[PDB]
Design an enzyme around this catalytic site. Structure first.
Site, PDB file in Angstrom:
ATOM      1  N   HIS A 144       0.759  -1.248   0.000  1.00 34.36           N
ATOM      2  CA  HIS A 144       0.000   0.000   0.000  1.00 34.36           C
ATOM      3  C   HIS A 144       0.790   1.298   0.000  1.00 34.36           C
ATOM      4  O   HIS A 144       0.371   2.267  -0.624  1.00 34.36           O
ATOM      5  CB  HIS A 144      -0.985  -0.003   1.162  1.00 34.36           C
ATOM      6  CG  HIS A 144      -2.114   0.963   1.008  1.00 34.36           C
ATOM      7  ND1 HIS A 144      -2.260   2.070   1.820  1.00 34.36           N
ATOM      8  CD2 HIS A 144      -3.186   0.959   0.178  1.00 34.36           C
ATOM      9  CE1 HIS A 144      -3.375   2.701   1.499  1.00 34.36           C
ATOM     10  NE2 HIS A 144      -3.956   2.047   0.508  1.00 34.36           N
ATOM     11  N   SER A 149       1.237  -0.803  -6.490  1.00 35.07           N
ATOM     12  CA  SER A 149       1.686  -1.868  -7.383  1.00 35.07           C
ATOM     13  C   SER A 149       2.637  -1.356  -8.446  1.00 35.07           C
ATOM     14  O   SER A 149       2.653  -0.170  -8.773  1.00 35.07           O
ATOM     15  CB  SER A 149       0.494  -2.495  -8.104  1.00 35.07           C
ATOM     16  OG  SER A 149      -0.358  -3.156  -7.197  1.00 35.07           O
ATOM     17  N   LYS A 163     -12.370  -6.701 -12.885  1.00 36.98           N
ATOM     18  CA  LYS A 163     -11.351  -7.442 -13.609  1.00 36.98           C
ATOM     19  C   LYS A 163     -10.946  -8.657 -12.746  1.00 36.98           C
ATOM     20  O   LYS A 163     -10.754  -9.753 -13.262  1.00 36.98           O
ATOM     21  CB  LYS A 163     -10.140  -6.554 -13.924  1.00 36.98           C
ATOM     22  CG  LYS A 163      -9.155  -7.199 -14.893  1.00 36.98           C
ATOM     23  CD  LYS A 163      -8.048  -6.246 -15.312  1.00 36.98           C
ATOM     24  CE  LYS A 163      -7.093  -6.914 -16.297  1.00 36.98           C
ATOM     25  NZ  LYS A 163      -5.974  -6.007 -16.654  1.00 36.98           N
ATOM     26  N   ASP A 164     -10.847  -8.463 -11.431  1.00 36.30           N
ATOM     27  CA  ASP A 164     -10.499  -9.551 -10.508  1.00 36.30           C
ATOM     28  C   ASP A 164     -11.572 -10.642 -10.526  1.00 36.30           C
ATOM     29  O   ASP A 164     -11.280 -11.827 -10.335  1.00 36.30           O
ATOM     30  CB  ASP A 164     -10.344  -9.029  -9.067  1.00 36.30           C
ATOM     31  CG  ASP A 164      -9.009  -8.314  -8.826  1.00 36.30           C
ATOM     32  OD1 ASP A 164      -8.099  -8.380  -9.690  1.00 36.30           O
ATOM     33  OD2 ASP A 164      -8.870  -7.681  -7.752  1.00 36.30           O
TER      34      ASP A 164
HETATM   35  C1  HEM Z   1      -1.109 -15.960   0.929  1.00 30.67           C
HETATM   36  C2  HEM Z   1      -0.084 -15.276   0.112  1.00 30.67           C
HETATM   37  C3  HEM Z   1      -0.073 -14.051  -0.595  1.00 30.67           C
HETATM   38  C4  HEM Z   1      -1.078 -13.162  -0.769  1.00 30.67           C
HETATM   39  C5  HEM Z   1      -2.513 -13.204  -0.245  1.00 30.67           C
HETATM   40  C6  HEM Z   1      -0.555 -12.088  -1.574  1.00 30.67           C
HETATM   41  C7  HEM Z   1      -1.296 -11.002  -2.030  1.00 30.67           C
HETATM   42  C8  HEM Z   1      -0.826  -9.975  -2.835  1.00 30.67           C
HETATM   43  C9  HEM Z   1      -1.660  -8.982  -3.484  1.00 30.67           C
HETATM   44  C10 HEM Z   1      -3.197  -8.787  -3.268  1.00 30.67           C
HETATM   45  C11 HEM Z   1      -0.853  -8.230  -4.259  1.00 30.67           C
HETATM   46  C12 HEM Z   1      -1.278  -7.097  -5.218  1.00 30.67           C
HETATM   47  C13 HEM Z   1      -1.731  -7.616  -6.598  1.00 30.67           C
HETATM   48  C14 HEM Z   1      -0.690  -8.511  -7.254  1.00 30.67           C
HETATM   49  O1  HEM Z   1       0.385  -8.006  -7.650  1.00 30.67           O
HETATM   50  O2  HEM Z   1      -0.942  -9.726  -7.375  1.00 30.67           O
HETATM   51  C15 HEM Z   1       0.498  -8.689  -4.024  1.00 30.67           C
HETATM   52  C16 HEM Z   1       1.636  -8.117  -4.561  1.00 30.67           C
HETATM   53  C17 HEM Z   1       2.925  -8.619  -4.433  1.00 30.67           C
HETATM   54  N1  HEM Z   1       3.257  -9.781  -3.767  1.00 30.67           N
HETATM   55 FE1  HEM Z   1       2.015 -11.049  -2.827  1.00 30.67          FE
HETATM   56  N2  HEM Z   1       0.776 -12.309  -1.866  1.00 30.67           N
HETATM   57  C18 HEM Z   1       1.078 -13.523  -1.300  1.00 30.67           C
HETATM   58  C19 HEM Z   1       2.328 -14.133  -1.391  1.00 30.67           C
HETATM   59  C20 HEM Z   1       3.465 -13.586  -1.996  1.00 30.67           C
HETATM   60  C21 HEM Z   1       4.744 -14.254  -2.119  1.00 30.67           C
HETATM   61  C22 HEM Z   1       4.924 -15.734  -1.708  1.00 30.67           C
HETATM   62  C23 HEM Z   1       5.609 -13.359  -2.655  1.00 30.67           C
HETATM   63  C24 HEM Z   1       6.978 -13.470  -3.001  1.00 30.67           C
HETATM   64  C25 HEM Z   1       7.925 -14.403  -2.442  1.00 30.67           C
HETATM   65  C26 HEM Z   1       4.852 -12.166  -2.937  1.00 30.67           C
HETATM   66  C27 HEM Z   1       5.356 -11.033  -3.547  1.00 30.67           C
HETATM   67  C28 HEM Z   1       4.621  -9.920  -3.921  1.00 30.67           C
HETATM   68  C29 HEM Z   1       5.157  -8.763  -4.569  1.00 30.67           C
HETATM   69  C30 HEM Z   1       6.622  -8.442  -4.787  1.00 30.67           C
HETATM   70  C31 HEM Z   1       4.109  -8.011  -4.970  1.00 30.67           C
HETATM   71  C32 HEM Z   1       4.179  -6.763  -5.833  1.00 30.67           C
HETATM   72  C33 HEM Z   1       3.923  -7.054  -7.315  1.00 30.67           C
HETATM   73  C34 HEM Z   1       3.963  -5.791  -8.167  1.00 30.67           C
HETATM   74  O3  HEM Z   1       3.161  -4.877  -7.930  1.00 30.67           O
HETATM   75  O4  HEM Z   1       4.786  -5.719  -9.092  1.00 30.67           O
HETATM   76  N3  HEM Z   1       3.541 -12.327  -2.551  1.00 30.67           N
HETATM   77  N4  HEM Z   1       0.477  -9.835  -3.254  1.00 30.67           N
HETATM   78  C1  LIG Z   2     -11.194 -12.587  -0.166  1.00 27.36           C
HETATM   79  C2  LIG Z   2     -11.607 -12.790  -1.547  1.00 27.36           C
HETATM   80  C3  LIG Z   2     -10.845 -12.168  -2.637  1.00 27.36           C
HETATM   81  C4  LIG Z   2     -11.553 -11.939  -3.903  1.00 27.36           C
HETATM   82  C5  LIG Z   2     -11.448 -10.673  -4.634  1.00 27.36           C
HETATM   83  C6  LIG Z   2     -12.437 -10.422  -5.728  1.00 27.36           C
HETATM   84  C7  LIG Z   2     -13.107  -9.116  -5.834  1.00 27.36           C
HETATM   85  C8  LIG Z   2     -14.529  -9.170  -6.488  1.00 27.36           C
HETATM   86  C9  LIG Z   2     -15.696  -8.901  -5.509  1.00 27.36           C
HETATM   87  C10 LIG Z   2     -16.967  -8.521  -6.299  1.00 27.36           C
HETATM   88  C11 LIG Z   2     -17.693  -7.305  -5.641  1.00 27.36           C
HETATM   89  C12 LIG Z   2     -18.458  -6.563  -6.751  1.00 27.36           C
HETATM   90  C13 LIG Z   2     -19.192  -5.374  -6.154  1.00 27.36           C
HETATM   91  C14 LIG Z   2     -19.784  -4.463  -7.228  1.00 27.36           C
HETATM   92  C15 LIG Z   2     -20.641  -3.380  -6.631  1.00 27.36           C
HETATM   93  O1  LIG Z   2     -20.797  -3.298  -5.471  1.00 27.36           O
HETATM   94  O2  LIG Z   2     -21.184  -2.547  -7.578  1.00 27.36           O
HETATM   95  C16 LIG Z   2     -22.549  -2.073  -7.441  1.00 27.36           C
HETATM   96  C17 LIG Z   2     -23.352  -2.824  -8.563  1.00 27.36           C
HETATM   97  O3  LIG Z   2     -23.290  -4.204  -8.276  1.00 27.36           O
HETATM   98  C18 LIG Z   2     -23.943  -5.023  -9.156  1.00 27.36           C
HETATM   99  O4  LIG Z   2     -24.544  -4.690 -10.118  1.00 27.36           O
HETATM  100  C19 LIG Z   2     -23.835  -6.520  -8.781  1.00 27.36           C
HETATM  101  C20 LIG Z   2     -22.656  -7.284  -9.408  1.00 27.36           C
HETATM  102  C21 LIG Z   2     -22.631  -8.754  -8.959  1.00 27.36           C
HETATM  103  C22 LIG Z   2     -21.205  -9.271  -8.722  1.00 27.36           C
HETATM  104  C23 LIG Z   2     -21.265 -10.669  -8.132  1.00 27.36           C
HETATM  105  C24 LIG Z   2     -20.372 -10.816  -6.897  1.00 27.36           C
HETATM  106  C25 LIG Z   2     -19.606 -12.098  -7.089  1.00 27.36           C
HETATM  107  C26 LIG Z   2     -19.411 -12.880  -5.801  1.00 27.36           C
HETATM  108  C27 LIG Z   2     -18.170 -13.770  -6.002  1.00 27.36           C
HETATM  109  C28 LIG Z   2     -16.875 -13.120  -5.482  1.00 27.36           C
HETATM  110  C29 LIG Z   2     -16.180 -14.010  -4.438  1.00 27.36           C
HETATM  111  C30 LIG Z   2     -14.920 -13.309  -3.895  1.00 27.36           C
HETATM  112  C31 LIG Z   2     -22.700  -0.566  -7.870  1.00 27.36           C
HETATM  113  O5  LIG Z   2     -22.936  -0.339  -9.296  1.00 27.36           O
HETATM  114  P1  LIG Z   2     -23.112   0.954 -10.103  1.00 27.36           P
HETATM  115  O6  LIG Z   2     -21.686   1.473 -10.099  1.00 27.36           O
HETATM  116  O7  LIG Z   2     -23.553   0.781 -11.568  1.00 27.36           O
HETATM  117  O8  LIG Z   2     -24.121   1.988  -9.476  1.00 27.36           O
END
Ligand code: HEM
Ligand SMILES: CCCCCCCCCCCCCCC(=O)O[C@H](COC(=O)CCCCCCCCCCCC)COP(=O)(O)O
Ligand SMILES: CCCCCCCCCCC(=O)OC[C@H](COP(=O)(O)OC[C@H](O)COP(=O)(O)OC[C@@H](COC(=O)CC)OC(=O)CCC)OC(=O)CCCCCCCC
Ligand SMILES: CCCCCCCCCCC(=O)OC[C@H](COP(=O)(O)OC[C@H](O)COP(=O)(O)OC[C@@H](COC(=O)CC)OC(=O)CCC)OC(=O)CCCCCCCC
Ligand SMILES: CCCCCCCCCCCCCCCCCC(=O)OC[C@H](COP(=O)(O)OCCN)OC(=O)CCCCCCCCCCCCC
Ligand code: HEM
Ligand code: HEM
Ligand code: HEM
Ligand code: HEM
Ligand SMILES: CCCCCCCCCCCCCCCCCC(=O)O[C@H](COC(=O)CCCCCC)COP(=O)(O)OCCN
Ligand SMILES: CCCCCCCCCCCCCCCCCC(=O)O[C@H](COC(=O)CCCCCC)COP(=O)(O)OCCN
Ligand SMILES: CCCCCCCCCCCCCC(=O)O[C@H](COC(=O)CCCCCCCCCCC)COP(=O)(O)O
Ligand SMILES: C/C=C(C)/C=C/C=C/[C@H](OC)[C@@H](C)[C@@H](OC)[C@@H](C)CCc1oc2c(O)c(OC)cc(OC)c2c(=O)c1C
Ligand SMILES: C/C=C(C)/C=C/C=C/[C@H](OC)[C@@H](C)[C@@H](OC)[C@@H](C)CCc1oc2c(O)c(OC)cc(OC)c2c(=O)c1C
Ligand SMILES: OC[C@H]1O[C@@](CO)(O[C@H]2O[C@H](CO)[C@@H](O)[C@H](O)[C@H]2O)[C@@H](O)[C@@H]1O
Lengths: 93, 57, 62, 126, 248, 385, 385
Positions: free
Chosen positions: G202, G206, G228-229
């Protein structure tokens, strides 16, 4: 970082209190003071003096409850004794 | 804790971690032996050691 | 009142000599606390660690 | 929670009534002396919880001289409290000095806020 | 609740293990085991007590080995899958008198004698209650008390009607050390043994407690002094107010 | 800037426990929070180490705890610490909640902090209940039966919810195994709620015994309060050690040293001491549904305090009538607990019903009425015309 | 301001998931992190629900898992989801790590983020090991035996550490019961480490596929990346479901359907697939101590990358040589896994030794040499003199 909601407390340099002026404080290093020997006579009179001002707020409610408890407890002991069987039958049903 | 006595060993400095840790090791030994000796002596005659000795016949 | 005229602290100030009395007492207290705390922490960690060692009922060799 | 406009309304009613005034005021005087805030060098108005818009408006409008004085009483009260002592008798706030210096600023702020709320919700009868 | 329903309060006897610095009297534990074996064991199990735990507490390794071997336990089946028995060993738990609850009840007119491994901790009154119960059977119940057939009167038992009859009588056991085997002596000894069965860590726990309480007491006093020193500058702080000259 | 401030991780430690500006006048009642954190740590650590030797199967549960007491090296210390620790957790929590009540800590701007605290209180009671069930003694089986049955009062689906919780016809193997799994989980949820509690506390800082602003005179947490907290940490440990090593079963029930029996509920059954006041409140209502509702309401009523306290000043320090009634409330709570430890007999039934009324009256009637009277008293006792 | 920004709790959510300024050009490879968060959630939830029906006693373990498979409603779904979910967790993690390697995500200012990542990797491997032991099949017992014995290589105190881990003379009841207790715990420590991971992320945000600053063109996380996720969350669930419902035992070993036998190690013993590369590295060293040290070093060597990458630009996108060798490293890692699945025979032994050398040479020789060369090529390829 994102803008966060203002509260009633800040941090060092901007605590959020009013502007201060005219107040002067003085202090002396703990190292230059008597090795915590000014305890008795300077804290034994103050102790119990503080509790002399508070004890009634605690003691009266405590007394009311302790006596209410004792009264009910003694009445219960009587109700379940041979001498209280008559009254027990009366108040139980 | 006399000022002069403390100064002979530590000269106005606080006791350092290394010495604290080292001192804790010595304390652990001496304290345990001291407590154990006091405890066993206070219960002399009740312990198995004392009873096993009594059973000489 | 002039800010140059410092209030009375005599009640808490060390009258007698040896400006290290408060220091020696303070450092002995801190030191003794650190020592007993260190031995206490060690005893505690060992208590937990030893609970993982073989239990009395498994130490039976046949 | 209870507004000062409401406290004053009820209080003034008691004060303007010869009957209630003779019956309530003496009780109030003993309540205040038992409270003990004056023994810490505080005036009642120093006790009002300030973490709300009305009080912040009131405190901002408080003239500098009185603001500096309030700051000192609050600080001195904290120092006395932490030492678990009361101030020497001669430093206690006297009944004559326990004046509602902030109240008029509070009442004014409340009246303005009440009117804003009324105007924000006015209904038009065509 | 009536007195009868609650049961007579058990008085406080002067157990030599009462008190923060007191260990159990191990000679009493040893004698108590004998009372358990010769009297209680016929109806009461001691399932949670392993033979090996008696070693160094009330008997020698050899003595316990010999006691354990007087009993038979299920061994692993032979090379043909047939069941076989083996003598007891230190690792085994003291065997109970009954093979199951049904047999237990059948031998006691429907009642089930509880396991005694934890009886001292499982009853309000602890040692006092156990002792008072064993020595509290009157020859006859108080007048007006109808005792259910098969029951026995004992004031200390809630309800007064207990399925266990008085089992301790003068000289029924011959104490190895020469101690006169009176009813109260046997009750005292067996209760002490049962307290050890329930709290085998007793002696060491109290020793560790002494060390722990001394260290923590010193630490608490030490922390107060350290705190006072660290706060000395704030505690004696002095403030003075000189109203600022009006202008801005 | 200093590393403790620039580093992403240390900056959090610094803001929360080193440089955090504390009101110079907070007294020893403000040490209970750190004590609650210590309790949670003590419980989780002793619990994990005991879990290594525990078996949740209904036929093995009671014996596995005995195995911990007898065979595990220092197992009795772990168990007595965990059991006596739970009691201490509640005593300190009661004191923490009482301090808040006395000093008006629940008042704005700390309503969120207070509400999160109520949630934590509920989770902690639930956690303690789950753990007690794990011993599988007589009190465990019956407490599990009664408490799960509380849900049978829910109209229409009540019985289904209970059967679901049980995982069968009654409290059995499925029940104990799920209760242990859940007992392991909730403490982690509590830890997360504690983080939320601390976040809410941090934005406004702590209040103080005077009930006024602490912004004019703050002192850093480090050294001052770090060392002041240490004083109570050692006192707490000293007292806990006295119980753990010298009187480990005083706070418990002898019936829990008897294996659970589905066919017999002992006449001597009594809830854990910290649950007694709430148990008494439930018993005071001669109706199943209303009794359950009233008991939960006894906890939820804590949420009405920021709204029923009509006072213009924060806290009871300078309030004669409020101070008196606060202590009436405190001893009424203790009485409720004593009544809970008694049989349902005359005159305890009536006493319990009156004390129950007083409990609720405090929040709903006494606080608002008294606080209003006091506002007026403060006004007419100085102002004149 | 908006409530999502003003509120103490919502502000964190808004800061990380709603208003978080994201580089406009991050591609689908940046979706693996959210997938890892999903995996952790899946494992914890399925794990807890299964824990309610599991017994850790060595004589009951294997049968309790069968009970989950046969008697528990939807139990087979929970188990296959948990087992296959673990495999997917590692595949996604390898991709997440590979993404970082390719794009120079480990470079300043994200070294702390990378290092925390390495810790998470180690904890995840340990957690999966503990979980596998809980089934108590043949692979469970022998894996537990071999892995715990790894510590017997520590000089002087090695054997004592192993006996301590076992709680006895070998992998027995105490070992399985403590492994289950620890299997429950570590996932929560991982969760805490993920929070620390997200905090490091944070403060710098990224990186992106161009390896340059993303400060000139950001777009909010909400909607853009939230949706996208979702694309990859569904693809992940689809693929996982195909395995869970149609080919649930393809990623596992048949030997784990045979209860553990302390007297027989099956000839067909093979470690779980995600551990094969490290397994091959250990087997490549004909010495007990050095084999163990070398395997652990294969994980720790990840920490030298921020120092061995001498390049002046972040990432491989514009680097011919670096791209070539990155793929040499990837396929070399796969080969190591394949070698680990083979028996100790010619010519697999030499192949494993060469592949092991290539693995380490990549970080210690190839990256620094190639990056220095590329720096110069970029210079002389345009500059006149
Ligand atoms: C339970 C395990 C982990 C979780 C939940 C996690 C989650 C995340 C998330 C949400 C991001 C931002 C989006 C992305 O770049 O994918 C991130 C970025 C990153 N993570 Fe992890 N991560 C995990 C493990 C690891 C491991 C095992 C490594 C490396 C040994 C790692 C290295 C990094 C790095 C360097 C970034 C920055 C990537 C960039 O922005 O270029 N992460 N991770
Ligand atoms: C811990 C888990 C990690 C997973 C990360 C994935 C992130 C995706 C979460 C989806 C939230 C979407 C919210 C959209 C919203 O609030 O916009 C609301 C509209 O929401 C909708 O129309 C409903 C979309 C239905 C998405 C179905 C959810 C999928 C459940 C499976 C995900 C399991 C993780 C506001 O919309 P507006 O901008 O047009 O006014
Ligand atoms: C109980 C089972 C759980 C175990 C947890 C125990 C944790 C402690 C709980 C007690 C507590 O919170 O009491 C706070 C109350 C408020 O105090 P204050 O801030 O107004 O103090 C000013 C002080 O002189 C500063 O003095 P100073 O800092 O210099 O030393 C203070 C004192 C502190 O002692 C403690 O640790 C607390 C008792 O050390 C001593 O001098 C003791 C000498 C042996 O302290 C008091 O003054 C006591 C008033 C009565 C309270 C009775 C408790 C009800 C159960
Ligand atoms: C078993 C455990 C894993 C299961 C879950 C994994 C799910 C995600 C893993 C795959 C991945 O991350 O691949 C990213 C790679 C980079 O792509 P890019 O950012 O440069 O895309 C530009 C795109 O056209 C934008 O296009 P757009 O956003 O408009 O739609 C893209 C596409 C996305 O499809 C996906 O679900 C993502 C792969 O949707 C479609 O039109 C497909 C129609 C069926 O996308 C590719 O080109 C794939 C390269 C193959 C390497 C895979 C190696 C795995 C061993
Ligand atoms: C402890 C050490 C751990 C190390 C683990 C090593 C990882 C093991 C293997 C993980 C599987 C996936 C490999 C991940 C590689 C992709 C990483 C990446 O980020 O690739 C980006 C790259 C092209 O991206 P560009 O931005 O350069 O494209 C030009 C746009 N102008 O994308 C591409 O060039 C296309 C990607 C093609 C991937 C081929 C993967 C083959 C993997 C075989 C799977 C295993 C089978 C058993
Ligand atoms: C001195 C040896 C003995 C000791 C220390 C002993 C102790 C006890 C104790 C403490 C109880 C529990 C009472 C309660 O529930 O509070 C009990 C119950 C019982 N005992 Fe014994 N006992 C002994 C010998 C015997 C013998 C020899 C028999 C069989 C002939 C016997 C039969 C029973 C029965 C049937 C009960 C159940 C009583 C009931 O619940 O009503 N006991 N005993
Ligand atoms: C696991 C339990 C808990 C922990 C660890 C915890 C911790 C803390 C800490 C460290 C503080 C600051 C120091 C203090 O005032 O003691 C605090 C303050 C506070 N807590 Fe808690 N708490 C817990 C439970 C509760 C509960 C159950 C409530 C209320 C139902 C609550 C209400 C409050 C309030 C209102 C304050 C502010 C006190 C003030 O400054 O006036 N807490 N808590
Ligand atoms: C918020 C913290 C916790 C509370 C309030 C709590 C409370 C309790 C209580 C009241 C008991 C019954 C003690 C007895 O009467 O013997 C208990 C037992 C138990 N708890 Fe916890 N506990 C907590 C956390 C944990 C954790 C994290 C674990 C991890 C598995 C754990 C494992 C156990 C075990 C194995 C028992 C059975 C042994 C025993 O009875 O002491 N507890 N707990
Ligand atoms: C990062 C999280 C986790 C990972 C990587 C993980 C991994 C594993 C693995 C690989 C297995 C063996 C699966 C098999 O081959 O059958 C397993 C089993 C198990 N896990 Fe986890 N697990 C995680 C979290 C949890 C949690 C939090 C619990 C809660 C207690 C849990 C409970 C279990 C149980 C009961 C089993 C035995 C049943 C089975 O074999 O599926 N797991 N885990
Ligand atoms: C439920 C818990 C959730 C977690 C909430 C987070 C609370 C934080 C409390 C943690 C206190 C421990 C902090 C010690 C680490 C500080 C040193 C540091 O960050 O040095 C870091 C490097 O750290 C590492 O490589 C590994 C850190 C792993 C820490 C694992 C415990 C240096 O970071 P630096 O600030 O100098 O910036 C780098 C220049 N771009
Ligand atoms: C590692 C632990 C997790 C880290 C904690 C940070 C992440 C928090 C994410 C949780 C999302 C849930 C947020 C819902 C709460 C937002 C509403 C709110 O705070 O309203 C609060 C009152 O909340 C409560 O009474 C109870 C909140 C309990 C929440 C239990 C989950 C109103 O607070 P407010 O911001 O309006 O204060 C007034 C400022 N003039
Ligand atoms: C993880 C927190 C657990 C702490 C529980 C605190 C309650 C007080 C009694 C604890 C007794 C357990 C140990 C024992 O029996 O040792 C006893 C000695 O205990 C002490 O000295 C206790 C003083 C406490 C110091 C603790 C500092 C904080 C610990 C942090 C660890 C990193 C006996 O020791 P021994 O077996 O003779 O070597
Ligand atoms: C899967 C998890 C579940 C179902 C969690 C459920 C949690 C419910 C509540 O916690 C929030 C609940 C524990 C809490 O109610 C507010 C307590 C004050 C309940 C107090 C309570 O205790 C008793 C007890 O302990 C007993 O012991 C032997 C026996 C009892 O009767 C004889 C009771 C009893 O009659 C009551 C009301
Ligand atoms: C209480 C907790 C403890 C003790 C945790 C210990 C954690 C240790 C390490 O994780 C950090 C370790 C799992 C990790 O080493 C880096 C793996 C790559 C180990 C890889 C590994 O697996 C094998 C395996 O799975 C087997 O299955 C049947 C059999 C095996 O030999 C035949 C192996 C084996 O020879 C190796 C090297
Ligand atoms: O079941 C025992 C049986 O014994 C009798 C014999 O008269 O009871 C007498 O002896 C008991 C043994 O201590 C006493 O408890 C009992 O009070 C006494 O009357 C039968 O009455 C009884 O059924």
């Amino acid at each position: 970082g994102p803008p966060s909601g203002k509260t009633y407390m800040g941090w060092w340099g901007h605590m959020g209190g009013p502007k201060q002026k005219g107040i002067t404080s003085y202090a002396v290093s703990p190292y230059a003071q008597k090795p915590l020997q000014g305890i008795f006579h300077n804290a034994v009179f103050n102790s119990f003096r503080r509790f002399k001002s508070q004890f009634l707020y605690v003691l009266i409610p405590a007394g009311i409850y302790w006596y209410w408890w004792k009264n009910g407890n003694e009445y219960n002991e009587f109700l379940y004794s041979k001498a209280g069987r008559e009254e027990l039958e009366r108040v139980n049903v | 804790s006399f000022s002069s006595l403390y100064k002979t060993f530590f000269k106005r400095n606080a006791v350092f971690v290394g010495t604290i840790f080292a001192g804790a090791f010595v304390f652990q030994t001496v304290f345990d032996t001291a407590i154990t000796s006091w405890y066993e002596n206070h219960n002399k005659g009740k312990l198995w050691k004392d009873v096993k000795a009594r059973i000489a016949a | 009142k002039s800010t140059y005229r410092t209030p009375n602290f005599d009640d808490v100030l060390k009258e007698n000599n040896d400006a290290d009395k408060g220091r020696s007492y303070a450092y002995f207290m801190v030191g003794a606390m650190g020592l007993l705390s260190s031995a206490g922490a060690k005893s505690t960690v060992e208590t937990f660690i030893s609970s993982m060692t073989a239990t009395a009922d498994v130490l039976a060799m046949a | 929670p209870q507004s000062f406009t409401s406290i004053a309304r009820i209080g003034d009613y008691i004060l303007k009534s010869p009957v209630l005034s003779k019956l309530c005021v003496p009780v109030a005087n003993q309540f205040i002396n038992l409270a003990g805030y004056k023994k810490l060098g505080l005036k009642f108005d120093d006790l009002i919880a300030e973490e709300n818009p009305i009080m912040q408006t009131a405190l901002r409008r408080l003239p500098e001289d009185e603001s500096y004085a309030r700051a000192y009483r609050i600080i001195r009260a904290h120092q006395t409290e932490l030492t678990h002592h009361l101030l020497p008798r001669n430093e206690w706030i006297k009944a004559q000095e326990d004046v509602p210096y902030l109240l008029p600023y509070i009442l004014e702020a409340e009246a303005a806020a009440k009117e804003k709320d009324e105007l924000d919700n006015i209904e038009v009868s065509k | 609740m009536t007195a009868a329903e609650h049961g007579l309060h058990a008085p406080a006897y002067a157990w030599s293990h009462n008190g923060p610095f007191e260990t159990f009297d191990h000679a009493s534990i040893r004698r108590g085991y004998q009372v358990y074996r010769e009297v209680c064991a016929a109806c009461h199990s001691l399932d949670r007590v392993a033979w090996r735990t008696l070693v160094g507490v009330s008997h020698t390794n050899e003595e316990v080995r010999n006691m354990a071997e007087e009993f038979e336990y299920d061994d692993e089946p032979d090379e043909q899958g047939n069941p076989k028995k083996r003598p007891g060993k230190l690792s085994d738990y003291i065997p109970g008198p009954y093979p199951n609850e049904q047999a237990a009840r059948a031998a006691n007119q429907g009642a089930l004698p509880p396991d005694l491994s934890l009886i001292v901790k499982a009853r309000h009154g602890g040692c006092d209650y156990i002792f008072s119960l064993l020595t509290g059977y009157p020859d006859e119940p108080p007048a007006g008390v109808a005792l259910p057939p098969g029951s026995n009167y004992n004031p200390y038992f809630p309800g007064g009607s207990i399925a266990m009859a008085r089992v301790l009588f003068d000289d029924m056991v011959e104490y190895e050390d020469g101690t006169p085997a009176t009813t109260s002596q046997m009750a005292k000894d067996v209760t002490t043994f049962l307290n050890w069965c329930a709290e085998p860590e007793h002696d060491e726990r109290k020793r560790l407690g002494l060390k722990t309480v001394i260290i923590l007491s010193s630490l608490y006093l030490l922390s107060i002094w350290v705190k006072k020193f660290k706060w000395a500058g704030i505690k004696t702080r002095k403030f003075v107010f000189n109203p600022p000259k009006p202008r801005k | 800037m200093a590393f403790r401030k620039s580093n992403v991780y240390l900056s959090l430690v610094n803001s929360y426990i080193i440089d955090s500006p504390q009101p110079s006048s907070i007294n020893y009642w403000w040490n209970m929070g750190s004590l609650l954190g210590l309790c949670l740590v003590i419980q989780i650590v002793t619990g994990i180490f005991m879990a290594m030797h525990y078996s949740s199967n209904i036929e093995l549960a009671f014996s596995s705890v005995e195995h911990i007491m007898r065979d595990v090296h220092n197992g009795y210390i772990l168990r007595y610490l965990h059991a006596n620790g739970a009691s201490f957790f509640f005593m300190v929590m009661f004191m923490h909640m009482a301090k808040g009540l006395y000093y008006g800590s629940y008042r704005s701007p700390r309503v969120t902090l207070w509400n999160v605290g109520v949630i934590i209180f509920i989770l902690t009671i639930a956690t303690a209940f789950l753990g007690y069930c794990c011993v599988y003694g007589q009190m465990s089986h019956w407490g599990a039966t009664v408490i799960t049955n509380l849900f049978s009062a829910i109209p229409f689906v009540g019985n289904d919810i209970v059967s679901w919780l049980w995982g069968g016809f009654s409290v059995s193997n499925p029940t104990i195994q799920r209760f242990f799994a859940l007992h392991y989980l909730v403490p982690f949820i509590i830890a997360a709620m504690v983080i939320m509690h601390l976040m809410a506390l941090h934005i406004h800082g702590s209040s103080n015994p005077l009930g006024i602003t602490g912004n004019l005179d703050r002192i850093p947490m480090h050294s001052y309060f770090i060392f002041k907290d240490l004083v109570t940490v050692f006192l707490f440990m000293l007292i806990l050690a006295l119980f753990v090593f010298y009187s480990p079963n005083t706070l418990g029930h002898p019936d829990n040293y008897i294996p659970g029996n589905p066919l017999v509920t002992p006449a001597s059954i009594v809830p854990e001491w910290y649950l007694l006041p709430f148990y008494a409140i439930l018993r005071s209502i001669p109706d199943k549904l209303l009794g359950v509702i009233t008991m939960f309401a006894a906890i939820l009523v804590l949420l009405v305090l920021p709204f029923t306290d009509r006072s213009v000043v924060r806290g009871n320090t300078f309030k004669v009538l409020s101070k008196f009634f606060f202590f009436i409330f405190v001893f009424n709570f203790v009485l409720l607990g004593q009544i809970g430890a008694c049989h349902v007999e005359v005159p305890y039934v009536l006493m319990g019903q009156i004390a129950t009324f007083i409990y609720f009256a405090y929040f709903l009637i006494i606080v608002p009425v008294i606080s209003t009277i006091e506002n007026v008293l403060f006004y007419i006792g100085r102002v004149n015309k």
